[PDB]
Amino acid sequence: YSTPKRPYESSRLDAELKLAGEFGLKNKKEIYRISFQLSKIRRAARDLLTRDEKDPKRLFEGNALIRRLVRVGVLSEDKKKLDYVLALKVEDFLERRLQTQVYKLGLAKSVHHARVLITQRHIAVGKQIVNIPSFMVRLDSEKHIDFAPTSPFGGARPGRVARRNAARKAE
């Protein structure tokens, strides 16, 4: 990642305040990392617009870029134009992470409940338990985010607090 140009202006501070509060982020490094690679993405798409129609670079790298952006999921299926890559922005990228997605699918009650579910390993996309919150789920892994079968919020055996309370109430 890389720090911004003027990192301490008040619009940037209220921006990062709204982003970290609305998406449950821990520090500025999440925003700065995802915005750095978004800057690379649309700095490339700017050059793909500054070259002309029927350029080989524009044709092939343009449909390649919009198809892998659609498959990451930040771009919808119908807007297959290259100016929407310029209209893309940072919260379109961090709505795709797993903490945001767990909360939006409703397995958690807030983004903080989603973050602690993910870091306590109750969430598995597909086959594998994912355990970091900033995961960038894709458009095919969007619908298999569910509770892990190794976890008491799935169907598994209940954890140590529940079983110790059950044992002490059996005593």
């Binding site: 086959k127 569910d146 169907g155 055996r157």
Partner: protein
Amino acid sequence: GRVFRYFGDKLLISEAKQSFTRVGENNLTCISCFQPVRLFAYTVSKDLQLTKYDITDFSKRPKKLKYAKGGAKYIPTSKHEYENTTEGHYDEILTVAASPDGKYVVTGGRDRKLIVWSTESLSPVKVIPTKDRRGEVLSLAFRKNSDQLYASCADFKIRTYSINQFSQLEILYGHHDIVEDISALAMERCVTVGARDRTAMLWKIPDETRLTFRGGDEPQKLLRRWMKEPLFFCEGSIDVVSMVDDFHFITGSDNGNICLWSLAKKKPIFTERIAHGILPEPSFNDISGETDEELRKRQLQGKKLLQPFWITSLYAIPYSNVFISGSWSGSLKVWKISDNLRSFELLGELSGAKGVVTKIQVVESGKHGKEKFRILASIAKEHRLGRWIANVSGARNGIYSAVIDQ
């Protein structure tokens, strides 16, 4: 294995001995059969009963042998998803599957269980729950000449089992709606179809990889293709499969399509748009509520709300040249696939099955050049998943057996 049984035009069609043995079970749901290398069959219903039949008395109707009826007694005393280890079904058994060797039948439904019953006594030998809340099983298929079961569960999941070891092999993920149907042959490949994502996937199960096949018919380009000189349109939901051989399969859709797909082409090779007709439009005495026939006819909008029958059962005889389609048009259809394997074509109809066809499969007899088969088809008056079905037009809950010859 390619298509080595080229016999589509060979056998007779129009004079089958069709016996519709009506049974007293509300909404039969599945049919499982068996042949060694006496033949038994299995049915199961929405009334929570499994029923064993003998079928080997080929020239006459099948014979009831044994009930196995779950009920409200089998509701677990926990409501907890991993102590679901009871011995009977308390809700909506959807699918049966007989073993290729015939020691067991294995069944399951909306009670998210797999109960494996012995054949000789219809007794529950083992219970395997699917360990989560939405884990309702919707289709079961053994791979042929084996002891390995492929169940398709509504968690967008496909579970695999070894039945004689009472073990689960592999859970494999990747559909996008509920995996409404499954199909397998002797290879360790499998072919599943999820309902509304309009894709059929086939799974290399040891590699745990897949090939996806989407649909993609559009009424814009299709009506332009007809406009170069017409009631046909897009697609609702791919519903049923059967793997014909190890390079091709066939899919039954929600808009009455039957499609033929290869292992080497994403888009389908062949379509057949209307396969069982379009439904009778709702009557003018049951659409509007006005007095005059002119306004009650204006409330039909012409042809805009005629909906096609959807194929709710499809069965390809393995490696053969002929498959059978069934819905609530009353008449099963028999189609043969051409020898160049790029098209199929309607041979004939089997018109003695009034109701929804919740299952089709065939039973073989005769030698390499002279053959006769009995086509079993479970007939209900209600779709095998939800109700949704009005205008029950003379239906009965039975087993439509047909005896086809030559």
